[PDB]
C-alpha cells in the first residue's frame, strides 16, 4: 500500500539489482532474456524478494584476462563487430600495460558519433575492468547500430 511514486524508485532499484546480478554472473554466453541454470536464479531471486555490443564487450574481457596479446585481441574484435554488422567501432585499453607508466591507445573505424541526443540514442558503449598482475586495465568499447533514421540521412530517388 505504498505510493506509486515511491514504487517507481523501488522497481528501478530492483531492476538495477537484477542488472548487476546478471552482469556479475553472465560470462559464459550472451543474453537470452529475463524472466518475469534457470532454476538456480529463479529460486535465488524469488527467495531474495520473499551481434551484440555488450556481448563483444564481455568477449574483450574474456580475451584479455588470460594473457593473450592486447593488440591482436583488439584487432580480432574489430573484425568481429564489422563481420557481425557494426557500422563502426572503437576500443580503448588503458592502464599499466607492461610499463610503469599508464598508456592508452585507440582503434577506431567508422563515424563514432560522440555528441547529442541522437548520438546517445544510436551509439552503444560499454566499459569493463580487468584485474592483472601489476594493476588493472580499463576497457572501453563502442559499437554503432546502423540506421529509425539518422537526422543527417538524406536521399531522394
Amino acid at each position: 500500500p505504498i505510493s506509486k511514486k515511491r514504487k517507481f524508485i523501488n522497481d528501478g532499484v530492483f531492476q538495477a539489482e537484477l542488472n548487476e546480478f546478471l552482469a556479475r554472473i553472465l560470462a559464459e554466453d550472451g543474453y537470452s532474456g529475463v524472466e518475469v541454470r534457470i532454476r538456480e536464479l529463479t529460486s535465488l531471486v524469488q527467495k531474495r524478494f520473499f551481434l551484440c555490443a555488450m556481448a563483444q564487450a564481455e568477449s574483450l574481457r574474456y580475451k584479455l584476462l588470460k594473457g593473450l596479446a592486447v593488440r591482436r585481441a583488439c584487432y580480432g574484435v574489430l573484425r568481429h563487430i564489422m563481420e557481425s554488422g557494426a557500422k563502426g567501432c572503437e576500443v580503448i585499453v588503458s592502464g599499466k600495460l607492461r610499463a610503469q607508466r599508464a598508456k592508452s591507445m585507440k582503434f577506431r573505424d567508422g563515424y563514432l558519433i560522440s555528441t547529442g541526443e541522437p548520438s546517445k540514442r544510436f551509439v552503444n558503449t560499454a566499459t569493463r575492468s580487468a584485474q592483472l598482475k601489476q594493476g588493472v586495465l580499463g576497457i572501453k568499447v563502442k559499437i554503432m547500430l546502423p540506421t529509425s533514421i539518422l537526422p543527417d540521412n538524406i536521399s531522394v530517388l
Binding site: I9, G12, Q15, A16
Partner: protein, 48 residues
Amino acid sequence: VHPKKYGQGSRQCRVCSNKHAIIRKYNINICRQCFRERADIIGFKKYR
C-alpha cells in the same frame, strides 16, 4: 552496543556500506558516489 532507530547510523548506503553522502530522496537509500553511475539504469534521465 548503543543502537537506536535514529540519526545517521540507523541507515547507510546499500553498496559502499558507508554513512557519508547518503541520499534518501524518495527513500532511494544510496550514496551519491555509486548513485552517479547507477543513475541511467535506474531511470534518472539527465535531461535539462
